[model samples]
Target: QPAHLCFRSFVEALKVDNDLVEINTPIDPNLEAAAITRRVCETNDKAPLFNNLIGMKNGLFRILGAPGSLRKSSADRYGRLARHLALPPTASMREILDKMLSASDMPPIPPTIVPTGPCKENSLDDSEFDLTELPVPLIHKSDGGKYIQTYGMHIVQSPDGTWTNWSIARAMVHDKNHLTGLVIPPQHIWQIHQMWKKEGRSDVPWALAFGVPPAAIMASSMPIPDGVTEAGYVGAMTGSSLELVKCDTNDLYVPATSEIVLEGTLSISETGPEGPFGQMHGYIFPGDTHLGAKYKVNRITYRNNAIMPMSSCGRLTDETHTMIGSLAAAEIRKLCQQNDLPITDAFAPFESQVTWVALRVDTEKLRAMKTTSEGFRKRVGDVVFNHKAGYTIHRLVLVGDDIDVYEGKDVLWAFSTRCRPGMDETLFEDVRGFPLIPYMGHGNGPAHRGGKVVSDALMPTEYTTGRNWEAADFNQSYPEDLKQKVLDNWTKMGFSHHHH
Candidate 1:
């Protein structure tokens, strides 16, 4: 079903669907919510709808945690994405990715002009407003500040004020009227800020919306090409123009049905040291911090009784990887196809968001195309890594059609048996790579600044020539009668567990 969005109305959909796991007992945002969501995600539990929050501002907000987790509802992982776009329930990871690209290609029907909506419910001007009071989750014990914008869409404009940008940049509650978050310089928002500086406008209009259409959420997480508009892609994904209402204080357009929206202006002149927040990178800054207190937010706004969503940015499978990595994988795959390379499928595993990349090559088709291994590998690397997605990737694993790139164990097994490391693996150095990656500087620099390689894990040409060595226990020709007997009498053999 195409999600009918009602800001602050998360329960609206959950109620009808009955996917909510409600807890009347109060829970704390600082560590409690993350603790619960982590356990649930790791162990594969139900979708949680936290009702009573410790230190929650009465009726001010509710926590919608883990908006997407695979185990939560194998469907829940892509369930949120599929529901928003109204796609089929069983849309595979690749289908979701391609759908996003299809949506990206959709002719954008910019947001329709609409009057005021739920976002104006509670306005916070200079007075009667204190941001520090909100139940911003203090995610990790050493986080620099309480983060309130981990899961919201930040709205900002280009210096020309023509192009509007909506994105998800995690932020921490700095003070009553200030928020500190990293705005990676080359990103759209940062580019717009540059235009403003160039045009001599020191600041710009902005808004950060939480819990908008889940499709909109997908658009935000994907690191779309620098200049492309996520808003239009949103429309494409939703198959309807994103309805818009003018910002109460700014000229930019916002999703008409956003659950919680914070309208404000960015002060480019003022930026204190930000971060030390648990990042997409598996580890924190480690006694490292955002330095000198970074962000200085000016104004704030919200829908009535808003839901303040937060992402516990930690290990692989959180929304960051599922949402961001899935989208990026789709995009990188498209990029390869568009570049005329012999790429089949690509995946950014949960183990390392951008750090690990796997691509499948069509061996028969490539040979038919007379593709050269060296040339093909170079072009594949140049095409995939040259883009922004290449930043954090460390080890690149290339495989043939026989292997499942999505399964890490499958990949490892393929390498262990088929690949003779030095001959099969290829590495490129000093190339422009993902800087946010923790490894480029020998784990010293804050970001990535190096090159990578295409470790072609594909079985050498001997296998491709249809003459292979003996295989393992799993795939080697099993007698049909023996297999049937095993299947029919497996339970009789006293093995009750199905998964093992």
Candidate 2:
């Protein structure tokens, strides 16, 4: 089934579960909308669909906050992603992970080209595109400009049309005619832009999409490699190809369910200093004089009635945690698969300092693969600490298969009982890191090369090989029947979900 892609479907889901919280706050592209959304996330309410964003022009747009959190009980955590794939409401994390990983091995299914979409129902050219007039939400107090968007998917292709990439990146409105954003090199879109430069074409085709399927958002963040098209994987994961229409002026396909689409080109030779905007690490970067980053802004295009999803960078609720971490975990998994490692599952926990990831491997199998604590640590660390996700993730925690990588407490417990600090903590230096790291900024290390420490939070290879350590919890040997009985009867006995 084709999943719903418009803002209305999302709003319906929010309202149906009493999740959408309406805020009468007079928000704008400035800090007002951002502050309110930050609080809304803290309260765990439905996404705030802003009706009165400051400086709104023609009432032609809406601002969506936190587009990909699992707080909506109806969504069943990752249910929104499952729904996009037409999967059952009860799809497991294993199933979701498998679906995505398998998709990378499939043949590319380039989107069928078509005509205009809702994004074209109204269009503003260079003269008519007075971007400042839009009800832009100022997402941060120190942001260089009102970040009109933070989670939109960007479309770019090689100059020779040999590659097409869909990616998720943060963007802000720099002026009535410009946008400021990041174009990470390892990212597919940036790669395509670099490809255009190789051809001496200073401008590259660019299209920004909003309200693409939730599954599409997940697909965009992942590293499917350069030649792999997202539409194919999206189809394999969701059981259907995303219905797409052509961009207004570019040779790109857009989701038919999009509320707005911006057709433009990324300039190769032009740039204006941008940022001071908050990042997913919950820190504010200083002015251009900071001496570390050289971000830039350029003009943008948009259709009327656009709904820009905003990511107010902070602790756990931002895109860095949701989309960014997922992408990183997938990359780690890819490394394991490529290297023929015995890792069955991996993830980058948002609470683990953002730049660190924890991977749980089936160590029994890794042991069979002749993996020792010292050997396994070096192999996994070399792969994870030097790859794409590892570029910013200077730390990785390698745990046994029994450890749940998603739970922060479990990881910490393993470290407390198992890890040997410096002895077990493997460190690698001279790695490049994402610029937002706080310790690196404060001169906590040697020079600028980022470092990673792989906390071996798993049972020692010698012990797990012959039962040298025993689990301390009673649940490990609990009576299965008794456990099942309590789970069945606890909700009936007023001991489950008794919310005030």
Candidate 3:
């Protein structure tokens, strides 16, 4: 089945798939709503649907948090991603990655444009627009201000309109008409804004659209190759084109079915102090004279009863890590094959909070490579650490097939068992990294680098002079017949196999 293209459809899908919980009681926008979401991500529970946001008018908005966070009891930690891609709830990580990798081969179908859409159902242009009127939550107490644009997608295009970039960047309320957010360098959005600067334009047209299709939101976090539009990739994921509508005051197009659309422009020349908010790295960085762009809202449009999706981003397993980690892992898996490295599965465990990336090595291919442990480890590290997805990721744990990269416990167990304390671990110096990472800001040696570690979580014998490793679990250690008999009498023996 094709992926659902509206916020309501995905909400219902989560409910049917047992990934959503509705809170009928009122929740305050300040800290309360965000705290609920933070707890959901921490516990791996259902996404919260806040039906009654405190101080919000009935027709103004509802809020859903942790839209893509996983269920605690899920067999696949990537269950939320599977749901986003329209896969079955029980789909495995391999299945999810297969679909994602396959989409790269398929030609992207351009979005289908219409004259108008539900995003334009209600309109507030010019003096009627005010972002402060919305139920924008102050996510973290340590945060500098209330952020309204965490989960929202910012749409920007080149001055010549040759490239349209959809990206996720935090935006905080600076005033009634302005928002101060990161418009940092090297990212696609900032690059596009630079194009506007070169053209002598002070402000570039932009739109922040919330509650787009689940596929769209997930795709936005992906590190697609430069010049590739996320909308087209989203189309490939859904097996059809996305339906988009022109914004009321801008030339950019947003998902037609998006629940809320904030049409605006980002100043190319003007800048303001923006942050100290909690980031995907799970830390808040203090800022002053940081040149954060001023986002001016020219118009506001939304459904009569809109839904604003929010992500309490300060920690592991939140929407930021879950979505970015999954997509980044998929990219890494593809990169490994292209680089001729031996890797089967790769993922960023939620517990790492987007810092560590676990790569499962394909032992068969690794065995064929006639290389020493040091040489092999360094080679693999070079390939991974040099990659774009490798920027935000500071640590890499290489494991065998016995471990599932997505499982935090599984990876930790392997790291403890297979990896040597310092011998097997390799560190690369001067590796380029995203400066937003809190540690990167204050480190010595090299700037935005110097903090990369690759742990060889593999036994040397697995590649040379092979040894049979026996698993200590009851399922694997005991004889099959005896285990079967025990399992058959599990209930009678005062034991249970059902998961909690």
Instruction: Give per-residue CA lDDT, model 1, range 327-438, as digits (tens).
Output: 6777777788878766688887776554677777767766666655566677778777677755556667777877777776777776577656677666676566555555
For model 2, how does the per-residue alpha-carbon lDDT over 282-386 read when each residue is reduced to its tens digit? 777656322111122232334455566777777666566766776677767878878887777777776674576778777667667755677778888887766
Clashing pairs in 3: none
- Candidate 3's residue-wise lDDT over 224-308, tens digit each? 7677888888788678899899997878999988888888888877777777788687876554235578988888888877889
User: For all the candidates, what are their Cα RMSDs to the real structure?
Assistant: 3.0, 3.6, 2.5
The segments of candidate 2 whose C-alpha lies over 4 angstroms from its true place after superposition are 1-8, 23-26, 72-75, 80-92, 288-304, 445-448, 462-464, 477-500
Model 3 C-alpha RMSD to native: 2.5
Give the range where candidate 3 is weakest over 10 consecutive residues by summed lDDT.
283-292
lDDT of each: 0.68, 0.66, 0.81
Preferred candidate (lDDT higher): 1 or 3 = 3
- TM-scores of the models, in the given order? 0.90, 0.88, 0.92
Instruction: For candidate 2, report its TM-score.
Output: 0.88
Better of 1 and 3 by TM-score: 3
Q: Assess candidate 3 and give its TM-score to the true structure.
A: 0.92
